[PDB]
Design a protein around this ligand. Structure first.
Ligand SMILES: [Mg+2]
Ligand SMILES: [Mg+2]
Length: 308
């Protein structure tokens, strides 16, 4: 063994990949080339518009890139809503996806679903946000559509979470960020350390469990984490056929940021998936060292996480 693999960095602003790069030059087995040098083993590409087309064309060079072409399908709200509606064993089993509708500046089922709820006298407050975009949280259909026509960005209206689980003594809402790594072979690895972002400000799984227990008859693994694993798995297993690199001339892996919400019933809902998530300062090192361990050296060996 004992080789020297190469790599280019096309995304300077990525803290997660600037960190991976420092660990790559650390191994003393990696050499960073020039931005436009075509002879790399690894490419830590740019967030948007990455030149996938020019990969794997240098004969003899096995190439790996830190992005899965077409993964924005799962990372763009509008696309995410559509990917679920179509999907057979998903749209009818998605008890974890908020009721969503895409509107360009559809809109048909929205009303037929807004009214029903009006005539059944139940929670009927929605939220308006952009797919690649700035949000509005009203309760009147027209008080939203007419607002999505002005902005002109093709948003989606989602059933807002009215009864969210809170955190005392500050009594404040939160969301959970989960890290998932998908290697070149399509193994789904979930980083054990998650993170909670609260309002009016951050709490790791550690502190979060000494709360879901010392003030409730349940554990973090038995209530939320369990559900989180199921949603991640479903979403990625559903996306695979549209992004598999099985028959492509290069390999790819990607780190995803899954963001969730929990209501009072202790139910977990998917809020969104982030294709280029940053990290929490305390985790970078352990996280990034895991990306080189599982997604990089697993392809380019050197001298010497929960798998869903
Ligand atoms: Mg990158
Ligand atoms: Mg990635």
């Amino acid at each position: 063994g004992s080789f020297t693999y190469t790599f280019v960095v096309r995304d300077e602003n990525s803290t997660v990949y600037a960190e991976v790069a420092k660990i790559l030059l650390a191994s003393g087995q990696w050499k960073r080339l020039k931005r436009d040098n075509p002879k790399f083993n690894l490419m830590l590409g740019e967030r948007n518009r990455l030149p996938f087309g020019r990969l794997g064309h240098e004969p003899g060079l096995v190439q790996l890139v830190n992005y899965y072409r077409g993964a924005d399908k799962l990372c763009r709200k509008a696309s995410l809503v559509k990917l679920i509606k179509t999907s057979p064993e998903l749209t009818e089993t998605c008890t974890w996806f908020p009721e969503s509708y895409v509107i360009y500046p559809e809109r048909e089922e929205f009303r037929s679903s807004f009214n029903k709820k009006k005539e059944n006298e139940e929670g009927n407050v929605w939220i308006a946000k952009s797919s690649s975009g700035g949000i509005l949280i009203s309760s009147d259909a027209t008080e939203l559509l007419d607002f999505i026509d002005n902005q002109g960005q093709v948003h989606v209206i989602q059933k807002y979470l009215e009864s969210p689980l809170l955190l005392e003594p500050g009594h404040r809402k939160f969301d959970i960020r989960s890290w998932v790594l998908v290697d070149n072979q399509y193994n789904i690895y979930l980083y054990r350390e998650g993170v909670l972002r609260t309002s009016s400000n951050e709490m790791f799984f550690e502190e979060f469990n000494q709360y879901l227990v010392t003030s409730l008859n349940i554990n973090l693994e038995n209530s939320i984490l369990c559900q989180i694993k199921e949603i991640i798995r479903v979403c990625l297993s559903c996306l695979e056929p549209a992004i598999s690199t099985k028959y492509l001339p290069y390999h790819s892996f990607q780190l995803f940021g899954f963001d969730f919400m929990v209501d009072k019933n202790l139910k977990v809902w998917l809020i969104e998936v982030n294709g280029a998530p940053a990290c929490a300062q305390k985790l970078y090192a352990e996280l990034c060292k895991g990306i080189v361990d599982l997604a990089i050296s697993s392809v380019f060996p050197l001298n010497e996480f929960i798998k869903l």
